[PDB]
């Protein structure tokens with residue numbers, strides 16, 4: 001029995017546990033693994049929750065029942081976990097509807113808060129300008145603070161908490177589109193555990209909306225807040241889109257963390273920033289936005305400069321250390337996000353979907369049109385890197401190889417993420433029958449390091 | 465020489481690893497991956513040497529010469545414990561009235577998947593006056609003990 005020697009082994013982790021549960025038609029094996037789930041860290045299984053809950057819905061009933069017990073155990077433990085189970089189960093169904101209705105059968109205040117948010121963005125469809133949308137929103141959110149605090153929390157947050165106050169003056173509609181997404185700031189109170197503590201107490205000049213760093217907006221907002229004296233207090237930011245499908249976004253989130261862990265383990269100096277996604281339904285969702293970063297478009301627009309111009313002004317001369325650091329961050333983040341766009345086949349890449357942060361990193365956003373779905377290095381970027389024959393540009397091409405090489409060494413973990421999700425998906429990114437083929441094939445496991453180096457060079461050329 | 469030759473049966477719903485209980489007790493091997501079969505190993509009881517003949521299935525010739533009955537129910541599947549009444553009937557109809565019945569709760573390693581109460585299933589043993597024990601072929605917990613008692617209690 002080599003197999004049991006494997007499961008009993010230290011080699012057995014949450015990843016491989018799901019891998020066997022995904023293939024084995026052995027009911028004796030399925031039931032064994034469904035037991036080992038309880039023996040994992042609650043955090044580690046969490047990352048693969050979308051995977052597990054997707055196998056539950058769109059696979060043999062002999063697999064869903066093996067996962068069901070562990071789910072209901074955690075649903076019973078964490079109110080938050082219970083919530084995100086319901087959300088996922090509904091957004092990916094098109095089976096576990098019975099369980100979903102069980103989860104919702106406590107979460108009343110939270111679901112009220114979500115609906116209220118989603119409804120707010122709906123009514124902004126009439127007001128056709130960006131500015132008109134914001135004015136209604138700010139008054140629309142001012143109504144929210146009339147039933148706060150409440151047993152409400154932002155799942156996007158990395159800690160337990162209650163929502164005490166929402167500074168309506170600070171929120172802003174992000175575009176003029178029919179179902180535009182608004183960004184809101186939320187004051188919360190951190191705690192030991194949500195399940196244990198009951199809602200906080202209530203207590204009833206500033207309120208000016210500017211474009212500034214995160215550290216400062218946190219200060220002006222707290223000063224004007226009644227809850228601005230508790231050491232508990234902390235500010236959160238969430239993007240609320242009431243009409244965009246975030247499932248492909250979530251998928252790309254997992255893929256990004258996974259590439260990130262690989263490069264961090266393989267000790268490859270690459271830099272990417274995945275943003276916390278949340279799936280309310282197939283219709284809607286929320287994003288935990290990257291503060292202190294804006295699109296290259298909104299950067300080139302406000303200052304009317306070239307990217308290289310902005311860098312030198314904001315950081316310093318080529319010779320200043322603060323520029324070298326800012327340039328080094330641009331290269332690393334640029335190189336990593338190339339491989340991310342390559343391996344995922346990310347499309348619709350313009351300076352509107354690419355943020356720029358205070359340190360100098362770049363952060364791609366909006367991950368529709370990946371892989372199958374569909375309807376480059378500009379000179380501006382290459383200039384920031386010192387030019388085609390600058391040493392810092394070789395360093396950019398160098399990181400991709402090292403990055404891609406380390407990606408090959410762990411191709412197994414990455415592909416698993418996508419392959420499972422494709423199961424029973426009417427999603428656009430799984431249009432072609434063989435999508436996973438191109439995905440796997442894009443790693444080029446067959447290639448040598450030398451041939452791998454040639455492919456990187458050839459690919460950088462086609463980039464331009 | 466071996467003193468006596470016992471014949472005990474392994475009955476119950478398919479999937480409860482009674483063929484694995486059989487393997488672990490005699491050959492000491494367990495396989496996660498999956499006709500009528502029997503196998504025997506001898507043990508020393510009360511200063512005696514006994515070749516316990518464990519039978520296994522996947523009809524009356526089965527219960528012919530049956531000395532002790534091993535009712536194996538899965539703890540992770542409540543329906544298996546439910547069919548014990550249907551398995552007693554099969555025993556009541558075909559099995560020797562003298563045979564000693566020991567209720568077996570296998571797959572006890574599945575602690576987090578327990579569907580059958582350890583205390584309750586032990587209560588059904590008293591209502592029927594039969595010995596009870598929960599076992600696990602994957603870690604060999606209470607495996608040799610089950611036959612050690614059934615073969616000992618067969619006298």
Ligand SMILES: COc1ccc(-c2sc(NC(=O)C3CCCC3)nc2C)cc1S(O)(O)Nc1ccc(O)cc1
Pocket residue numbers: 174181239241249275287288289290291292293294295298352353355365366367
């Ligand atoms: C899935 O789509 C998004 C993905 C990421 C973000 C942001 S936004 C931000 N901070 C910011 O400050 C904003 C960045 C540019 C505007 C300010 N950090 C993050 C992670 C926002 C959105 S979206 O609103 O739903 N659509 C959108 C598309 C293109 C845009 O040109 C602006 C918004």
Ligand SMILES: Nc1nc2c(ncn2[C@@H]2O[C@H](COP(=O)(O)OP(=O)(O)O)[C@@H](O)[C@H]2O)c(=O)[nH]1
Pocket residue numbers: 027028029031032477478479480481482483484495496497498522570571572573574599600601602603
């Ligand atoms: N986890 C676990 N699985 C077991 C145990 N005992 C048996 N199994 C599994 O249960 C499955 C069915 O057992 P099987 O050999 O078919 O017994 P049968 O129904 O009497 O033929 C096998 O694949 C075993 O791996 C146990 O103690 N723990």
